Amino acid sequence: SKVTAVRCKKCRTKLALSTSFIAHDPPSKESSEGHFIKRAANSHRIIDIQESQANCSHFFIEPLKWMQPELQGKQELEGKFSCPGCSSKVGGYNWKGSRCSCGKWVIPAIHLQTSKVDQFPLQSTALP
Amino acid sequence: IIEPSLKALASKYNCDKSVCRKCYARLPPRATNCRKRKCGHTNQLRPKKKL
Amino acid sequence: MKVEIDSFSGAKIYPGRGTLFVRGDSKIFRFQNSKSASLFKQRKNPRRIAWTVLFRKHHKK
Amino acid sequence: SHRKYEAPRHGHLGFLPRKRAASIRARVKAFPKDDRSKPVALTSFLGYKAGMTTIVRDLDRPGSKFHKREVVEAVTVVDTPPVVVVGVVGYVETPR
Amino acid sequence: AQGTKFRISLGLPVGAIMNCADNSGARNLYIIAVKGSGSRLNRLPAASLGDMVMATVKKGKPELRKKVMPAIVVRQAKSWRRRDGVFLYFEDNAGVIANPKGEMKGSAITGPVGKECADLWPRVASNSGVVV
Amino acid sequence: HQHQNAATLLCCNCGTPIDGSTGLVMCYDCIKLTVDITQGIPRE
Amino acid sequence: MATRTQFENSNEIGVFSKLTNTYCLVAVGGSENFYSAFEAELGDAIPIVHTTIAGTRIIGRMTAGNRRGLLVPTQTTDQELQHLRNSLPDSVKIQRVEERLSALGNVICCNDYVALVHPDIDRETEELISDVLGVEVFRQTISGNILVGSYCSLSNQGGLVHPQTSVQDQEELSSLLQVPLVAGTVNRGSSVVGAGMVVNDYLAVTGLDTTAPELSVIESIFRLQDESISGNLR
Amino acid sequence: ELARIKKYASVVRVLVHTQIRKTPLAQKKAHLAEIQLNGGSISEKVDWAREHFEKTVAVDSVFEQNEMIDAIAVTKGHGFEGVTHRWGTKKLPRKTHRGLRKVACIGAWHPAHVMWSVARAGQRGYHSRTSINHKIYRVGKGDDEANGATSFDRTKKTITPMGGFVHYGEIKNDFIMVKGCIPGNRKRIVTLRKSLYTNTSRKALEEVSLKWIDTASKFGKGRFQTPAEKHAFMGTLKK
C-alpha cells in the first residue's frame, strides 16, 4: 500500500501522517472488556450493559511536533487540543486510557476522534 | 483535571447531604429530622445517592 | 424610490399605490388603480379606450 | 356541565364601562416622573388631528431582513399651532 | 424547522386543491394541514406563500397517490403586501412536494416562483427558473 | 480528443468504486445496515 | 483548496455566495464563522463583497459572472447596483439584463472561456452575454435538466456534473466544453451540485455534510490538491 | 398669591389654551388645559410662568424628532351598537328564529342574575383612550415652503395634498407628523404627552431620514403630487 495523511476538516492541515497508528485492532469480545459496565455507588452493582460499537472511532498516534507547545505549557493529566488555525475540538490527550468505541484500553493515548477529521491518501490521484 | 482536593471541597455542599424520603428536601447529613413543616418533622431520612 | 409607468394605459405609479399582476407565463403587469385593472380582466384593448395614453399616441393628439 | 370546548374570552374587562366620555377633550391621567436636575420645560402639548398620509423611508435596523431597505409607512399629520400661556396653578399635598 | 418569514395574507384554507408545479408526476395537491399553525375554536388553519403544508395527491401517478407528504407553496392567488410598497398577486395557486427536511423531490419548477418562497427555502431557490 | 474519464460515480457512505445510473448512489452493502433501514417497528 | 463550511445552518453554499477568479460575493446575514472561511483562505488577493440582489440573500442563484463581467437581473435596485461598482475593480463590467428568465445563475453556467445557457433564452440576450463576458455561448441541457446552473458546477480546470448522466452524454459535453467531466454527489448525496459548492482556480468550498469520499472526487477533477511541522518528537 | 405658591405647593401646573383662530375649523372657542412642569426648584417653576404670562410657546422647544410620545384623545363615536360588532362575538347560524346577530346564552341558572362579564348591546366609541409609543418623524415649521421637501426629494411643496386635507383644510401652521394611527377622527382635539418611562430597547434609539412624503390628492385615487406637474403631463387644456 501507500502512505496516508490525516487532514483536518475546516482547517485543511495535515495533522498526522502515516508511520504512526498503534491501531490495537482486535476487540476483546469477552464479557468484561468488550462490554461497557456501568456500576453503582456500592457493592459493585451493575445497572447498565452497553454493547460495543463496530469500528474504533479514534486514531492513536505518537506525541508529535505540533502538540509540543500544548503538552509542555500547562502540562496536566488530561485535556484537549485543536487544529492550529481554527481552534476546534479535534482530539484530546489522555494518559489514562479511553479504550475505543469498540473498546479495549490502550497505554497513554493521544486520541484523535474520527468525527470532524478525515483520512486521505498522500499518494497520487486514483483517476476514476 | 478536577484536582480532587477541590472535588472534596465541592462534594460537601452538593453530594454530602441527606434526602427526606417524603418531601425530597436537601438536608444536612447528620440531621435526625426534616426541617420542613409540611411533612410533619419526620425521621425517615435517606442518604443522597453518590455518582 | 422608483416611478413605474402603468402597464395598461400610461400613468405613473408613485410608491405605495395600486396593484401588480404576474401573468402565468412569467410576465409582470403593473396597474395604477382599480379602473385600469378591472378593464384588464375584461380583455379590453388600450388602443381603443379613449382616456388611455396609448390611444392619444396612436391618433397624434 | 363544563364548557366542552375551551375558548378565550371575547373582549377586555379593564376597559369597562363602554360609556360616553364626559368631554371631547381627553384628560391626561398621569404626567411623567419629575426630575429636578434638568431645566424647566413642558410635558404635554395640544394639537388638532388632520388626517393621514403615506411616507417612504430607509429602514436602518441591523441584523434584519429589511436592513438598508425602503419601507412605506403610514403617518398622521396633527395640526399643531403655537400655544399661549394664561395662568399657573399650584397643588399642595394632603393625605387625601 | 421553519425560518423567519414576515407575515403575508392567508389565502389557502384546509380543503384547497392547488396545482403541482414540479415534474414528479403529480398534477395537483390536496392540502390537509399547515405546519406551525395556531389554535382557535372553529378556525380553519390556512396556508400562505412560503409555508410548508401537508398535502395528498389526488391526481397523477399511482405511486404518489394515497399518501400524505409535505409540500411547499410557491404561488398564491390572494394578493399580499410587500414591505417596499406594492401589492402583487399571481394567476393561480401552486406547490411543490418535499421531504420533511426541506429538500425537494422535483427536478425543476415550471412557471414563476414567489420571491419570499425562494429566500425561506434554499432548495426551492436552486430549482427555480423565474423568481417573480 | 474528448476525455471524459469519470468512472461514473464512486459512493456516498463508503469509498467503494463504480456505481451506476438511475439513482441509488450509495453502495448496497451500506444501505443494508447503515443509514436507517426504515423498518422502525417492534419485531416481537 | 478544499474547505467545508456552512451558512447559518444550511449546507448549501452556492445559493448564498458567488466565487469567481477576481472577486467574490457573499450574503449579508451570516456569522463571523461563515465569513472567516472566505477571509482566511482568500486573504487580500480578491475582494469579498457583502451585498444583496433584488432584496434577497440568495445572490449566488440570481447573479451570473466570471473573470471579466457580472450580470444582474432587472429587479436589482439602483442602490444595490452602485454598491457593487464601487467595491469591485475597474476591470469587471457590470450590466443589468432584461430577462423573462429572471434568475440568471440557474440559467447561465460559465467560466473564462465557455458558457452554457438555458435553451429557451432569446436571441437579443445571447449577444449581451457574449458582449459582456467575452465568452462563446452554447445552448445545451445536462441530460434531464434544463437548469444548467444548479446541476453543473464548472471552472477552468474541469467540471462536476449531475450524477444521473450517461457516459455518451458526458462525452458530448466534454467535446463542447474542452474540459474533462466527472459525475459526482455533494453534501451526502445531493444531486444539486452547482449550488452545493463554489469553485475557482485556488479554492473550492463545499458544505459540511459532504463526506470525505465525495470531497476526494471533487479535489481530483479540479486538480487543486498538492508539511514539515508534522513530525515525531517523542 | 405667587409668593403663596413659592412657600407651599409641591407641584405646579400651567393653564394654556390653543390659538383656534389660526385654524380652519368653524369653532371659535378655545380648549383650555393644564400642563404639569418637570423643571427643578419650584421657585424656578413659578418664576418661569411669571415671565410667560401672555407669551407664545412654540412646538420645537418641547418635542424633537425621533422621540417616542403618547397620544391621548377621544375615539370616534358610533352610537348604539349591537352585540356582534361591539364585542366581536360569534353570529348564530342561519336557521335561527327571531334573530341571528345576537348572543344566545346569557348565563346559567345560578346565579339568578346577569353577570357583568357577559356581552351586551350599548354605546360603542367616543371613549377616552391612551395610545403609547409613537415615533415622531417630522416637526415642520409653518412659515416654510419646504414642508414636503426632503434632501432626497428636492421639490418645493407643502405637505398639504392637492385639494387640501379631506374635511380639514390648510395645514399652513406648525405640524407634528407622527407614525401610525392615533385614536380620534379628523377635527378632534388631541393631547400629546412625553413618554413616562425611558425606553431603550432597539426601536426608540433609531433615527429616521425620510425619502419622500406623499402629497397626492386624498380625495380619491390621486394620480399627481403637485399641480405644477399635472399641467406638464396632460398639456394644454381648453379651459
Contact H223 C33 (CB under 8 A): yes
- Which of H19, H69, H198 has the alpha carbon at shortest distance from D28? H69
E128 vs G146: CA distance, rounded Å: 11
What's at B6, amino acid-wise?
A: L
Chain G contact for F2 (CB, 8 A cutoff): yes
Contact G163 F8 (CB under 8 A): yes
G124 vs G76: CA distance, rounded Å: 20
How would you label A32-61 residue by residue, b for 16+ Cβ within 10 Å and e otherwise?
A: eeebeeeeeeeeeeeeeeeebeeebebbbb
Contact C16 D72 (CB under 8 A): yes
C31 vs C23: CA distance, rounded Å: 13
CATH class of G1-226: alpha beta
The SS3 of residue E13 is: strand
CB-closest option in A10, A62, A127 to G5 = A10
Contact G150 E131 (CB under 8 A): no
How would you label G134-160 residue by residue, b for 16+ Cβ within 10 Å and e otherwise?
A: ebebbebbbbebbbbbbbbbbbbbbbb
Rg value, chain H, Cα: 25
Chain A contact for G233 (CB, 8 A cutoff): yes
β-pair type (G3-4, G204-206): parallel
| Residues contacting A91, CB < 8 A, separation 6+ | A15, A59, A80, A81, A110, A111, A112, A113, A117
Contact A64 G5 (CB under 8 A): no
**What residues in A contact G230, CB-CB < 8 Å?**
14-17, 64-66
Where are the alpha helices (H) located in H118-181, listed in sequence order? none
Contact A41 B49 (CB under 8 A): yes
- Which of G54, H193, F16 has the alpha carbon at shortest distance from D33? H193
Give the number of C-H residue pairs with CB atoms closer than 8 Å.
17
Question: Whole domain around residue E19: which residue ranges?
Answer: 11-132
β-pair type (E109-113, E128-131): parallel
Count CB atoms within 10 A of the CB of residue E72. 25
CATH code of the domain made up of H58-75+125-239:
2.40.30.10
What does the DSSP 8-state code read for residue G106?
H
Residue H56: phi and psi, rounded to 5, are -85, 145
**What residues in F contact G217, CB-CB < 8 Å?**
10
How far is CA G79 from each of CA C1, E119, G83, G84, rounded to the nearest angstrom? 10, 20, 7, 9
A96: closest CA of chain F, how far (Å)? 32
Side-chain half-sphere CA neighbours of H210 within 13 A: 26
| Residues contacting H224, CB < 8 A, separation 6+ | H162, H216, H217, H230, H233
Q: Partners for F (CB, 8 Å, 3+ pairs)?
A: A, G
How would you label H181-205 residue by residue, b for 16+ Cβ within 10 Å and e otherwise?
A: ebbbebbbbbbbbbeeeeeeeeeee
* Burial status of residue H166 (CB atoms within 10 A of its CB: 0-12, 13-18, 19 or more): middle
* Burial status of residue C9 (CB atoms within 10 A of its CB: 0-12, 13-18, 19 or more): buried
G123 vs G127: CA distance, rounded Å: 7
Residue with cell string 453556467: G109
Contact D67 G55 (CB under 8 A): no
The residue of chain H with its CA nearest to that of D13 is: H117
CB-closest option in E85, E91, E129 to C23 = E91
What does the DSSP 8-state code read for residue G190?
B
Residue with cell string 472561456: G113
Chain E contact for C15 (CB, 8 A cutoff): yes
- Region at A94 (left for phi over 0; alpha for psi -120 to 50; beta for the rest): beta
Contact E83 D66 (CB under 8 A): yes
Residue with cell string 463590467: G93
Residue E39 maps to which CATH number?
2.40.150.20
E104 vs A33: CA distance, rounded Å: 46
What's at H166, amino acid-wise?
A: V
CA E18 to chain centre: 8
User: Is-contact G194 G153, C-beta < 8 A?
Assistant: yes
**What residues in H contact C12, CB-CB < 8 Å?**
223, 233
Chain E contact for C38 (CB, 8 A cutoff): no
B40 vs B28: CA distance, rounded Å: 17
β-pair type (G181-183, G159-161): parallel
- For chain E positions 20-49, those within 8 Å of chain D (CB to CB) are 40-41
The SS3 of residue H194 is: strand
Domain ranges of chain G: 1-226
> Total structural domains in chain E?
1
Strand segments (E) across G29-102 = 48-50, 64-65, 69-72, 93-96
What's at H94, amino acid-wise?
A: R
Chain A contact for F14 (CB, 8 A cutoff): no
Chain E contact for G18 (CB, 8 A cutoff): no
How far is CA B11 from each of CA A41, A116, H231, rounded to the nearest angstrom? 15, 35, 89
CB-closest option in C14, C34, C35 to H216 = C14
G20 vs A52: CA distance, rounded Å: 48
Count CB atoms within 10 A of the CB of residue A27. 18
The SS3 of residue C53 is: helix
Chain A contact for G217 (CB, 8 A cutoff): yes
**What residues in D contact E41, CB-CB < 8 Å?**
5, 7
**What residues in H contact D37, CB-CB < 8 Å?**
40
- For chain G positions 156-195, those within 8 Å of chain A (CB to CB) are 182
Chain F contact for A127 (CB, 8 A cutoff): yes
CB-closest option in A10, A62, A65 to G4 = A10
Give the number of C-G residue pairs with CB atoms closer than 8 Å.
6
User: Is-contact B18 B31, C-beta < 8 A?
Assistant: yes
Side-chain half-sphere CA neighbours of G198 within 13 A: 29
Residues in chain D that come right before a backbone break, where C and next N are over 2.5 Å apart? none
Is residue E114 included in any domain, yes or no? yes
E37 vs E30: CA distance, rounded Å: 17
The residue of chain A with its CA nearest to that of F9 is: A128
β-pair type (E52-56, E28-34): antiparallel
User: Is-contact H26 H169, C-beta < 8 A?
Assistant: no
Chain E contact for C41 (CB, 8 A cutoff): no
Q: Resolution in Å, one decimal, please.
A: 3.8
H86: closest CA of chain C, how far (Å)? 31
User: What is G141-159 written as a DSSP string?
Assistant: -BTTBS-TTTTEEE-SS-E
CB-closest option in G29, G55, G57 to D69 = G55
